Amino acid sequence: EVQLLESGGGVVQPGRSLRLSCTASGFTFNNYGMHWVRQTPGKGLEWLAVIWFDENNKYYADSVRGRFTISRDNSKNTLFLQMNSLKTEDTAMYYCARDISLVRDAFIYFDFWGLGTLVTVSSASTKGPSVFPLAPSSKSTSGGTAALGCLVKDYFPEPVTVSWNSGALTSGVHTFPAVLQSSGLYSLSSVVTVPSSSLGTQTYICNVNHKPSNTKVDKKVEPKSC
Amino acid sequence: ELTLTQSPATLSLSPGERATLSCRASQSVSSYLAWYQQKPGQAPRLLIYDASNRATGIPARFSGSGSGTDFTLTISSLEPEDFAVYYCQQRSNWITFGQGTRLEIKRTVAAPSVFIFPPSDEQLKSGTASVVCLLNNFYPREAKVQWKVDNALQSGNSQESVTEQDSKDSTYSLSNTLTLSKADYEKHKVYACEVTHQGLSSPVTKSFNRGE
Amino acid sequence: QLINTNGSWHIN
Ligand SMILES: [Cl-]
Ligand SMILES: [Cl-]
Numbered sequence A: 001e002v003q004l005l006e007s008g009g010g011v012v013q014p015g016r017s018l019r020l021s022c023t024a025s026g027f028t029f030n031n032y033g034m035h036w037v038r039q040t041p042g043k044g045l046e047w048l049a050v051i052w053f054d055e056n057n058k059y060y061a062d063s064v065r066g067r068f069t070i071s072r073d074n075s076k077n078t079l080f081l082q083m084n085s086l087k088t089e090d091t092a093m094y095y096c097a098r099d100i101s102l103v104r105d106a107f108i109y110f111d112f113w114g115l116g117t118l119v120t121v122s123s124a125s126t127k128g129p130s131v132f133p134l135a136p137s138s139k140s141t142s143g144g145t146a147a148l149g150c151l152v153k154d155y156f157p158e159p160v161t162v163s164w165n166s167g168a169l170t171s172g173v174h175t176f177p178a179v180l181q182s183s184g185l186y187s188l189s190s191v192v193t194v195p196s197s198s199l200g201t202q203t204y205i206c207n208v209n210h211k212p213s214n215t216k217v218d219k220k221v222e223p224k225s226c
Numbered sequence B: 001e002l003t004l005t006q007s008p009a010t011l012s013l014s015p016g017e018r019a020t021l022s023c024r025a026s027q028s029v030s031s032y033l034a035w036y037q038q039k040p041g042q043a044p045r046l047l048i049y050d051a052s053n054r055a056t057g058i059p060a061r062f063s064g065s066g067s068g069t070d071f072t073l074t075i076s077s078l079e080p081e082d083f084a085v086y087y088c089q090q091r092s093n094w095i096t097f098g099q100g101t102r103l104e105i106k107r108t109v110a111a112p113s114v115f116i117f118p119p120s121d122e123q124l125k126s127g128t129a130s131v132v133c134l135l136n137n138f139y140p141r142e143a144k145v146q147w148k149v150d151n152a153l154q155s156g157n158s159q160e161s162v163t164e165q166d167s168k169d170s171t172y173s174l175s176n177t178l179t180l181s182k183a184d185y186e187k188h189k190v191y192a193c194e195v196t197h198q199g200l201s202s203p204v205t206k207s208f209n210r211g212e
Numbered sequence C: 001q002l003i004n005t006n007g008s009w010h011i012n
Helices: B182-186
Strands: A003-007 A010-012 A018-025 A034-040 A043-053 A058-060 A066-073 A077-084 A092-099 A112-113 A117-120 A130-134 A145-155 A163-165 A172-173 A186-195 A205-210 A215-220 B004-007 B010-013 B018-025 B032-036 B047-048 B062-067 B070-075 B086-091 B101-105 B115-119 B129-139 B144-149 B158-162 B172-181 B190-196 B203-208 C002-005 C006-010
Touching: A003 A092, A003 A145, A003 B086, A018 A092, A018 A117, A034 A066, A034 A112, A034 A215, A043 A066, A043 A077, A043 B086, A058 A066, A058 B144, A077 A092, A077 A145, A077 B047, A117 B004, A130 A215, A130 B129, A145 A205, A145 B129, A172 B062, A186 B172, B004 B086, B010 B018, B018 B101, B032 B062, B047 B144, B070 B086, B115 B190, B115 B203, B129 B144, B129 B182, B129 B190, B144 B172, B172 B182
Parallel strands: A010 A117, B010 B101
Antiparallel strands: A003 A018, A018 A077, A034 A043, A034 A092, A043 A058, A066 A077, A092 A112, A092 A117, A130 A145, A145 A186, A163 A205, A172 A186, A205 A215, B004 B018, B018 B070, B032 B047, B032 B086, B062 B070, B086 B101, B115 B129, B129 B172, B144 B190, B158 B172, B190 B203, C002 C006
């Protein structure tokens, strides 16, 4: 089976360096050109570098030339990307990708992609979230549906996970993509809709886990008097 | 420097229907074009290369055509596993990608249920106030949120994100947070979220009065 | 050997 397993990703401060690795298996690595390509929500997919059959046969995008170096170690079936002089804007998902490599007379297309690894370039320090209630409205429609949730605020880095009632409550739950605040910390919300008639009786607890800071919080969300 | 523009930005269809996606190059790229599929959380998958050649393991329902500046990806009859984002790529002049076309499941229009949440007493103890507007289970995806505090439009102090299309009901939801200093929050009374959407004949406004 | 000439890719 063809595989391209990446590693080396993580949080790095601006101006410092990271080296990404991609270990190939299930094909003859030596016979393929290889590429690095990154992706961000706002700028989309951006090709960065290619290395061909020979180690010295390389090309780069303007955006990374002189800072990033692509290399290969055929003896260990490994592709590398040395990333120097990192900037905030280098934050992205980084993919290693195999070139079709003249199979069927074609080249410079990406015929197999690894799962990718997230690089976060930031000066922020690791920090567990504060968890605040999004309390169900005291004017919830009688015999109708009410919304409640948790605001999981000011954590770094990603990710946090959120469940409701220890996983017992899944129907009607929406956990939103995190947003990066101007502070450099992330914030996320998770909400759920439930029968208004359940508010007086049923307990609703959002379970928040932020592994990077070893933070677990259980937050009970209930109607606010007023 | 050679740019690729994809259209439409979003394509809304049902299983069984034919999908037609377009890619236009700023200048000629001959037949030097490829198409990829990508689902959330997964890596891209090559579909077509050299404009019209189908890649390994790709079902016959996918095909590509075109040359020069105009190209097309066709999916003859949609399967549920086909809803995803589709990208084009050229290798005529270096390497560039299009901005992507979202292929989403069509369903009837549904106006959002709107909810507004005041900041918690707990958060206020910290010096900051977050006010949240939830737009729940709506379709189609496009929606607009406007924040007003005592009728002053707020700009630059809010952020939002949106869920992926729901597996069951094919709707989207959106969460928008307005962030203010505690001092600013305490100086005002009326907090309002105004929502615009295709399913609403006129904009809906949810609001609350601080301390009430 | 992959060659890039003014953006155009070729094998030599
Ligand atoms: Cl170069
Ligand atoms: Cl997260």
